[PDB]
């Protein structure tokens, strides 16, 4: 289920991290907007820009601790606090997390592999409710 989902993604975090970040922006192109370097290169040429890898990297890294933290896919409201404070984030609204989590649940429903899809869809669902309780837009 979710716990071992997290294992799992962990274990293959950078290749999970591109290649969920890359469905996201391939599904939702008006995202890359909010990344301006992101524009007209391939998925191929993004994974060689040391700023996509990195930030791809630690999204990942800090979503799976708030994965790992949660109770029955419910996040911490610090960890929503959090994530809304962030000056990184100033000109995000919920429905930037909301497509993420649509591409992640789309990823996993896609790949062989037995993810705990449902409740992925619940967690982005209860975080993007954790995030407009700590005053994201
Ligand atoms: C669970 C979801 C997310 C987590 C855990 C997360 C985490 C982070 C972290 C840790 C950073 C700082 C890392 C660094 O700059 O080295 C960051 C920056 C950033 N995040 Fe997020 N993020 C999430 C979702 C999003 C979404 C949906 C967007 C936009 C649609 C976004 C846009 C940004 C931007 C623009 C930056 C800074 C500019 C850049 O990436 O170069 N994040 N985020």
Redesign the pocket.
Known sequence: GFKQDIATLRGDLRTYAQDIFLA?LNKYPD?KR??KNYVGKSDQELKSMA?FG??TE??????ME?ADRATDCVPLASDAST?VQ?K??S??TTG??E??FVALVEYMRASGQSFDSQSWDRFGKN?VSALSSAGMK
């Open positions: 996201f995202e909010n990344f700023k990195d930030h630690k999204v990942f890294n800090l979503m708030v994530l962030m990184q984030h000109g995000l930037n997390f497509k993420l975080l």
